[PDB]
Design a protein around this ligand. Sequence first.
Ligand SMILES: [Cl-]
Ligand SMILES: [Cl-]
Length: 85
Amino acid sequence: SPIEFDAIIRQVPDMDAAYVEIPFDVKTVYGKGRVRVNATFDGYPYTGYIVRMGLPCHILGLRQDIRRAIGKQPGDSVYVTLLPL
Ligand SMILES: [Cl-]
Ligand SMILES: [Cl-]
């Protein structure tokens, strides 16, 4: 049973990398610390980490190659699903 949500692709200005903000309380839902996830971005599979920035700020990185695969850039909306590993 995946957690699923729409998210805006965010980017630190002038950098190449992108990410999505996790729109729920990651600490309560998954427990403390980094969370390894099987994720999808518009259906495209990715395995990686939800990481804490300043609590409670959590993000998941969106790699450049996946962004090309689904044709989505910063500012675009993406449908994300998450399953813990
Ligand atoms: Cl929440
Ligand atoms: Cl972390």
